[PDB]
């Protein structure tokens, strides 16, 4: 069939000069408006197809799910112990190694707490610590990002590592620091080159600085894993994912095919931990920013929290069903924050058809989630913070199909169930006991965030006064 349209490619650079990597989301909007919902790009040697809108993304990830569940190979990951039976989950290639960790991560989380009141109470406990930390700032203006990252990170640590860390633990802080730095490494020109030419890694000079943060991250994590291997009580049912993983490694000794091995234990755990320390807290960072930028909405939320929960009892997942306005606000924060605009790259394993065009095997697929979350054809005021995007005239919460912050298909975020719970409990817990606002004498903060693979709100301070 006919391949997707797109800007005319240069001789060797291809379309590298037709894409503004400073604000790619905007550049792609222009391309979408110019060539359509499914267009092509030749980034150097990598053929790319961008998917815009719910339909294009869905036909690829759901309808053609089997053929689009693979990731682009990333040979550089070798530096972290990645191998055929050791791929973690996020960067894992479509196959048994992924499926085994995928199924394991999903079911273990569910067994450990997800969907039960135990996790809720654990989270609201961590929430209480978060509140107390906010209170230490008295009326003084501060940046909530660090405390949000620490509190959220403790929830995933509890699940994976069976413990939390004090907001000032050196190892905890270093772990969080390295995790955020390495999120800068995933976006480097050098990595692209070494990735195309695997052999170039034999030069210690290069290999030695390519993924230094991810390596530091894993190294720092090994120390924690080693202590855990020591405290673990195999005579009791696993308390966390690391123990569950460990018990599987026992059962799997002698099985060359099992992905439950030492190399993969640090990758899987680092996979879940890192993912959990940089997603939800960012959304929460957007949440608090939007709440000081729209005090009215913040009050409506507090009002609902008062009417349904009060200012005593700790929030509970059972409350959400009776808090449609707060649920709408949270969903809008996710929609507007648009924290993962271009999603995570996919790769076709077979030739497929999308919106009439043909997408050859091996094509790097880009799911433009931002275009689904800001689709002017679907949302009323896509470029505005508008809780009514998830509310009907009656005040009922409705979730449109264009709400794909987590993508779709067999590869969709496995942390969604955890994210849903964290956002509700942490958000209501914060607004239930605090009142946020822009610090007098300071300019209204921008609702425009700084572009990256993971989009954070622009730096800002706020005042948190008790209630
Ligand atoms: C509000 C927060 C979050 C957002 C917006 C988000 C978004 C995403 C997106 C866009 C993907 C890619 C889906 C695809 O490949 O098409 C994904 C993947 C993934 N996320 Fe998240 N995520 C969030 C939270 C977390 C959390 C809390 C965890 C849990 C540890 C997590 C774990 C993962 C994992 C393991 C994958 C890879 C799944 C696979 O390839 O099979 N994420 N997420
Ligand atoms: C275990 C690894 C160190 S292996 C090498 C790469 N990373 S990473 O720290 O660079 C990273 C962190 C967050 C991220 O963003 C996410 C995740 C989930 N949902 C939405 C966004 C992407 C990549 C770790 C990894 O695979 N995590 O999943
Ligand atoms: Zn444990
Ligand atoms: Zn209704």
Swiss-Prot record:
EC number(s) given by UniProt: 1.14.14.-
Q: Which GO terms describe its biological process?
A: alkaloid catabolic process; alkaloid metabolic process; arachidonate metabolic process; cholesterol metabolic process; coumarin metabolic process; estrogen metabolic process; isoquinoline alkaloid metabolic process; long-chain fatty acid biosynthetic process
Q: Pathway membership of this protein?
A: Cofactor metabolism; retinol metabolism; Lipid metabolism; fatty acid metabolism; Steroid metabolism; cholesterol metabolism
Q: What induces it?
A: By pregnancy.
Q: How does it sit in the membrane?
A: Peripheral membrane protein
Effect on the protein of changing residue 219 to P: In allele CYP2D6*93; >90% decrease of monooxygenase activity towards dextromethorphan and bufuralol
Read off the Pfam families from this record.
p450
Where in the cell does this protein reside?
A: Endoplasmic reticulum membrane; Microsome membrane
Residues that hold substrate according to the record: 271
Catalytically driven reaction(s): (5Z,8Z,11Z,14Z)-eicosatetraenoate + reduced [NADPH--hemoprotein reductase] + O2 = (8R,9S)-epoxy-(5Z,11Z,14Z)-eicosatrienoate + oxidized [NADPH--hemoprotein reductase] + H2O + H(+); (5Z,8Z,11Z,14Z)-eicosatetraenoate + reduced [NADPH--hemoprotein reductase] + O2 = (11R,12S)-epoxy-(5Z,8Z,14Z)-eicosatrienoate + oxidized [NADPH--hemoprotein reductase] + H2O + H(+); (5Z,8Z,11Z,14Z)-eicosatetraenoate + reduced [NADPH--hemoprotein reductase] + O2 = (14S,15R)-epoxy-(5Z,8Z,11Z)-eicosatrienoate + oxidized [NADPH--hemoprotein reductase] + H2O + H(+); N-(5Z,8Z,11Z,14Z-eicosatetraenoyl)-ethanolamine + reduced [NADPH--hemoprotein reductase] + O2 = N-(8,9-epoxy-5Z,11Z,14Z-eicosatrienoyl)-ethanolamine + oxidized [NADPH--hemoprotein reductase] + H2O + H(+)
Q: Look up the signal peptide feature and give its range.
A: none
Upon changing residue 456 to T, the result is: In allele CYP2D6*2, allele CYP2D6*10, allele CYP2D6*12, allele CYP2D6*14, allele CYP2D6*17, allele CYP2D6*45A, allele CYP2D6*45B and allele CYP2D6*46; impaired metabolism of sparteine
| Effect upon mutating residue 112 to S | In allele CYP2D6*89; >90% decrease of monooxygenase activity towards dextromethorphan and bufuralol
Changing residue 77 to I does what?
In allele CYP2D6*17; poor debrisquone metabolism
Listed binding positions for heme are 413
Write out the entry's keywords from A to Z: Cholesterol metabolism, Endoplasmic reticulum, Fatty acid metabolism, Heme, Iron, Lipid metabolism, Membrane, Metal-binding, Microsome, Monooxygenase, Oxidoreductase, Steroid metabolism, Sterol metabolism
Q: What is the effect of changing residue 307 to G?
A: In allele CYP2D6*94
Primary location group: endoplasmic reticulum
State how changing residue 313 to G affects the protein, per the record. In allele CYP2D6*25
Tell me the CDD domains matching this sequence.
CYP2D
UniProt lists the family membership as follows: Belongs to the cytochrome P450 family.
Q: What does this protein do?
A: A cytochrome P450 monooxygenase involved in the metabolism of fatty acids, steroids and retinoids. Mechanistically, uses molecular oxygen inserting one oxygen atom into a substrate, and reducing the second into a water molecule, with two electrons provided by NADPH via cytochrome P450 reductase (NADPH--hemoprotein reductase). Catalyzes the epoxidation of double bonds of polyunsaturated fatty acids (PUFA).
Protein name per Swiss-Prot or TrEMBL: Cytochrome P450 2D6
Which organism's genome codes for this protein? Homo sapiens
């Amino acid at each position: 069939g006919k391949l997707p349209p797109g800007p005319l490619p240069l001789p060797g650079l291809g379309n590298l000069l037709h894409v503004d990597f400073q604000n790619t989301p905007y550049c792609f909007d222009q391309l979408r408006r110019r060539f359509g919902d499914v267009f092509s790009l030749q980034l150097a040697w990598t053929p790319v197809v961008v998917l815009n809108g719910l339909a294009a993304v869905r036909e690829a990830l759901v309808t053609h799910g089997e053929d689009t569940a693979d990731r682009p190979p990333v040979p550089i990951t070798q530096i972290l112990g990645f191998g055929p039976r050791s791929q973690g989950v996020f960067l894992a290639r479509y196959g048994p190694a992924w499926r085994e960790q995928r199924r394991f991560s999903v079911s273990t989380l569910r067994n450990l707490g997800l969907g039960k009141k135990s996790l809720e109470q654990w989270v609201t406990e961590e929430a209480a610590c978060l509140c107390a930390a906010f209170a230490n700032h008295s009326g003084r203006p501060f940046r909530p990002n660090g405390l949000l990252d620490k509190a959220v990170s403790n929830v995933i640590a509890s699940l994976t590592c069976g413990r939390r860390f004090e907001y000032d633990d050196p190892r905890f802080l270093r772990l969080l620091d390295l995790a955020q730095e390495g999120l800068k490494e995933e976006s480097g020109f050098l990595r692209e080159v070494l990735n195309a030419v695997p052999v170039l890694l034999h030069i210690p000079a290069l290999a030695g600085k390519v993924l230094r943060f991810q390596k530091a991250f894993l190294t720092q994590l090994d120390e924690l894993l080693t202590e855990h291997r020591m405290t673990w009580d195999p005579a009791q049912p696993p308390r966390d994912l690391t123990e569950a993983f460990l018990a599987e490694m026992e059962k799997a000794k002698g099985n060359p095919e099992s992905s439950f091995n030492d190399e993969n234990l640090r990758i899987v755990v680092a996979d879940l931990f890192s993912a959990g320390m940089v997603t939800t807290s960012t959304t929460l960072a957007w949440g608090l920013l939007l709440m000081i930028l729209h005090p009215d909405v913040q009050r409506r939320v507090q009002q609902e929290i008062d009417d349904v929960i009060g200012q005593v009892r700790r929030p509970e997942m059972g409350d959400q069903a009776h808090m449609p306005y707060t649920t709408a606000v949270i969903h809008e924060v996710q929609r507007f924050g648009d924290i993962v605009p271009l999603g995570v790259t996919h790769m076709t394993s077979r030739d497929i058809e999308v919106q009439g065009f043909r997408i050859p095997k091996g094509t790097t697929l880009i799911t433009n989630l931002s275009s689904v979350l800001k689709d002017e054809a679907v949302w009323e005021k896509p470029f505005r913070f508008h809780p009514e995007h998830f509310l009907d005239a009656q005040g009922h919460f409705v979730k449109p199909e264009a709400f794909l912050p987590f993508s779709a298909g067999r590869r969709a975020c496995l942390g969604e169930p955890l994210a849903r719970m964290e956002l509700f409990l942490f958000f209501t817990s914060l607004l239930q006991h605090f009142s946020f606002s822009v610090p007098t004498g300071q300019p209204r903060p921008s609702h425009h965030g700084v572009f990256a693979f993971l989009v954070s709100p622009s730096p800002y301070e706020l005042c948190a006064v008790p209630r």
